[model samples]
Target: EVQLVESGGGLVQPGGSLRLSCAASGFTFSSYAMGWVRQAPGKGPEWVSLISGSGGSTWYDDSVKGRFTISRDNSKNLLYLQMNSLRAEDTAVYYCARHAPSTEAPDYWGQGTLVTVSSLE
Candidate 1:
């Protein structure tokens, strides 16, 4: 019954930064891990990062190693993603999902929030 609700769409100019949030409910947030996934305009899903809700340990994909960050606030059952130095290719829909302990894949997921990065500064 766990659910993740993401905010609405957003726009960011190239080289700018963006912050997106995911709110969790129906479960104890600190009892599981949260991960962020990305899907470009027409591409497949990409793993961004995963943050342990209880341990606070973070793991990032090599593709987004230095450009993105994943953080969480257990008290509020909220997770956050911060992307910096974005480019046109960074435009995508981001999803927040929960990972159960001892499992390797996400079990509950947020719908997704479309974020566009362009020259529309």
Candidate 2:
């Protein structure tokens, strides 16, 4: 019954900020690291950021290192993705998931959430 459910999507113009959440279920939230990935339309998925299972550390991709933050809320078994300086290039559907150490792939994924940009489209 392992699962990740993320919410918080809305319309925002350029220069605005965005925040999303992933509420984990079925297993121990800290059993594995949590990661966030984004996929732009017609493009391959890309890593955005991550937090260690025990909340000991975090890692951010070079592309979004400066503007992205991965926040953990273990009390509620929640993970957050916060970003500022939203740009036209930032429109994408983000998926929150648990990283499986077995096959080098994410074992559980949240239903993708799209952060739309009115100014971009």
Candidate 3:
């Protein structure tokens, strides 16, 4: 029973940066790869990259390679994602997921946290 726990609540700010973590529970961290997904306000989920636990290797989608980073800390059963140079278009729900069988599609995914980038002041 693997679970991805995310920090709560929607952020309200413009031109800001965010750091989110997903800690996997009830699973073996060494046996799976964690991934980062991006979902714009009105769009579907997009795969940003995948991070391997055994070697800390990462593979990113060509379109999202420059602005997204995925890293892991297997000792803490945690995976992290960070995005920079964000715009209003970058504001969306972000999720952390992991493949159940190491090289398969992600069977376990996070609920996602709301991140707003707007002049909502």
Candidate 4:
């Protein structure tokens, strides 16, 4: 019965940065893990990163390593995704989810936010 809501979307210039937030409700936020998935216009969802709700560990997809950071603030029942040095290719919708049992998919997910990035040069 947990629910997640995402915020933070708009245009970001190439090389700029963006931070997205996911707030949770209806469950103990620190009792589970959360993750992020990104979907480009014509492609399937891609695993971006995962954060341990207890602040014990973290993991990221090789494709997003170095450019994307995932973290959590259990005190606020919130999760975060910070992306830096963005590019046009980074434009897409991002989702936050609660880890599902026995699968790589999420048990519950946020509606998603479409992020746009364009070259500034």
Candidate 5:
């Protein structure tokens, strides 16, 4: 689990901050792009943002415009996401996905990271 190869779990306290990572080893990161899709508790997936591998260009859904941020590690071809002031509403499955094999949509997805906002440490 040193490298996400698949997504992993992260827990944060309500009103706290967190980072979610997605690891990829075999793929050429510069040639592909990464995205973050969110699934609310017991709900479907929602596209959060898409980040360009070349220089971190990003696009968000506008509705959640300023809440989510996407970034990547070119040196490791690993993807990272960060959110602040997480509310219980933010608890869900976050996935790192690629959109090259299927341009407009993600063709490959990380297993998924379930992040819960709690105070249990």
Candidate 6:
């Protein structure tokens, strides 16, 4: 079985930043591509970022193209989502998954973490 764990989804003010984490186990981390999917409060899931297994090449959706970044550490079997320039309306829940080259949905979907952009500071 393939497993992916996520952490570091934190609450932040509008001007701050947010980063969500993903850790893979029970499978080879470098064997398949990883993806970050985002879902708004009343919307369906959207593919925000995708990173190659080899740690080279990344693709981002236009909605968050310049506001988010994705990276992976093969040795640690971990993944990351670095989101900056936070906006109030950018709050959403995100998921991490392993995606095959020809697959739109994930082969292994991790748990979801909420991203809050508010004045909780």
Please tell me which model should have the higher lDDT, number 2 or number 3: 2
Clashes of each: 0, 0, 0, 0, 0, 0
lDDT of candidates 1 onward, in order = 0.83, 0.85, 0.74, 0.86, 0.75, 0.86
Instruction: Kindly indicate the candidate among 4 and 5 with the higher TM-score.
Output: 4
Residues 15-38 of candidate 6 have per-residue lDDT tens digits of: 799788898888778988899888
TM-scores for all predictions: 0.86, 0.90, 0.81, 0.89, 0.79, 0.89
Tell me how far the alpha carbon of residue 101 in candidate 4 is from the true structure, in angstroms, after superposition: 1.5
Which residues of candidate 2, in runs, are more than 4 Å off?
A: 103-106
lDDT of 5 at 34: 76
Evaluate model 1: give its TM-score. Answer: 0.86
True-vs-predicted CA distance for residue 86, candidate 1, Å: 1.0
Residue range 1-121, candidate 1, lDDT tens digits: 7678987458888888888889999988888878888898779987789988674599998877789888898888888888888878878899998887676664777999988987743
Pick the winner on lDDT between candidates 1 and 4: 4
TM-score (C-alpha, index-matched) for candidate 6:
0.89
lDDT of 6 at 68: 90
lDDT of 2: 0.85
Model 4 stretches astray by more than 4 angstroms: 102-106
lDDT of 4 at 55: 66
Task: For candidate 2, write residues 1-121 as lDDT tens digits.
Answer: 8878998866789888889999998988887789898899999988789899888899998877788889888889999998888777878999997888875654688998998766834
Question: Which ten-residue region of model 4 has the weakest summed lDDT?
Answer: 99-108
Model 3 TM-score on a 0 to 1 scale: 0.81
True-structure Cα RMSD, model 4: 2.2
lDDT of 3 at 59: 90
lDDT of 4 by residue, 1-121 (tens): 6688999867988889999999999988887889988899899998788988686899998877899888899889999999888878888899988885666763788999999998556
Local lDDT at 103 for model 3: 47
**Model 5 agreement with the true structure over 49-119: per-residue lDDT tens digits:** 88887844888876556776778888877777778777777888887777775566437777788888788
Residue-level lDDT for 1 in candidate 6: 70
